[PDB]
Design a protein around this nucleic acid. Structure first.
Ligand SMILES: [Mg+2]
Length: 102
RNA sequence: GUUCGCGAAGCUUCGUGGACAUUUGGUCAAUUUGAAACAAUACAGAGAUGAUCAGCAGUUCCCCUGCAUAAGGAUGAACCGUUUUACAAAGAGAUUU
């Protein structure tokens, strides 16, 4: 991964692969988090955010996804957004203990 | 042009007022640059399983043939890979205040 174009090519390919894996097992939720992580690594915060949102939409009742997303939000010192996300999660799911605790 | 009236010249001819009839067609403009596919060459090449082979489905932001809610398409196409956290409790040893 020397040049920018090379990176783009790599990244693009990876994204495509992820998409392919999703299209079959949309309801997986491990894959989605992996994808999100990858996006985060790539330092495209938008993309990562989108992916997480998509995952949530697929399976709202999946705490791990929520928590990982929150972590990601916090990781990038983007607290306000993270806070909002947390609030949303709480609204969605009150009787799960964990979100509140987080 | 048709004509039904008026006014001048010789029923014939000019000059007039009316009535009749009244707004088409274009999502488009004629060769490369607004998107057809097969074919061809080269290169490989055939689902499980040790091998050979049948058929059926399944997922999809892939379609094709088919009148088709028949049927058929390489098991029609891509799926075979990546896969480290709602993560705590107990015990032992070490440096810092
Ligand atoms: Mg066959």
């Amino acid at each position: 991964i020397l040049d920018l174009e090379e990176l783009r090519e790599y990244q693009r390919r990876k994204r495509t692969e992820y998409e392919g894996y999703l299209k079959r097992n949309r309801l997986d939720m491990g894959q989605w988090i992996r994808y999100a992580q990858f996006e985060i690594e790539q330092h495209d915060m938008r993309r990562a955010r989108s992916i997480f949102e998509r995952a949530l939409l697929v399976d709202s009742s999946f705490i791990p996804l929520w928590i990982r997303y929150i972590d990601a939000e916090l990781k990038v010192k983007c607290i306000n957004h993270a806070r909002n996300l947390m609030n949303r999660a709480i609204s969605t799911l009150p009787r799960v203990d964990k979100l509140w605790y987080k």
